[PDB]
A = this chain, B = another copy of it.
Amino acid sequence: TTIVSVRRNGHVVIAGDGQATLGNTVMKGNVKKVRRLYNDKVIAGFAGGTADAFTLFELFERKLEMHQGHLVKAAVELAKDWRTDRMLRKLEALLAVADETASLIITGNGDVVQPENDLIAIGSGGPYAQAAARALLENTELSAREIAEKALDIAGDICIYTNHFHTIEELSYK
């Protein structure tokens, strides 16, 4: 799976493919890896278990209620619980979550990372996506969405675990 987030001109997106792999075979090709949270004010993508994600995203909206939409703070409370809690600790996922404020990554290792230009590329195909996203951001006037999409397809072309089915969520605050 590959998940890409690009942010440009009051527009931030999160795109992901839809391949689920079991060993050396495709189990499902249309997994929805990107969704909306917190009255649609937040976009998010995840690598790994769907139910695992469902649980982590729910908790996140929760932490968000507790910090008035402050992305980062609620983001850390989750990176906090995630590593402490005996149950959450067992969960396995890679969260990519964004809003008008900022974009960031959330790992089970109690980490909240905010890459260089809010450019996120997680998943087995992450780096390939990042590489293309980078090339495009710095040499074309393309939109966030256009980049996320063209980047993700490139990833899809190189990464054996990423396909071409997409799901995109956008956020405009301009």
Contact = CB atoms under 8 A, between A and B. Distances in A.
Interface of A: 20-21, 24-31, 49-52, 54-55, 76, 79-80, 83-84, 87, 89-92, 105, 109-116, 124, 126-136, 138-140, 142, 150-151, 154-155, 157-161
Contact of A132 (B24, B89, B135): B135
Contacts of A28: 113-116
B111 A52 contact: yes
A113 B159 contact: no
> Number of copies of this chain in the oligomer?
11
Most buried by B among A31, A127, A131: A131
A130 B113 contact: no
Contacts of A92: 109
B24 A109 contact: no
Contacts of A89: 90
A76 B52 CA distance: 10
A127 B124 contact: no
Given A89-B90, A135-B136, A139-B150, A128 B51 contact: no
Contacts of A161: 24, 160
Contacts of A20: 113
Contact of A160 (B25, B50, B126, B131): B25
Nearest to A93: B110
A52 B91 CA distance: 18
Contacts of A112: 50-51
19 contacts: A20-B113, A24-B161, A25-B128, A27-B113, A27-B115, A49-B79, A49-B83, A49-B109, A49-B110, A50-B113, A51-B109, A51-B110, A51-B112, A83-B91, A92-B109, A131-B135, A131-B158, A132-B134, A135-B136
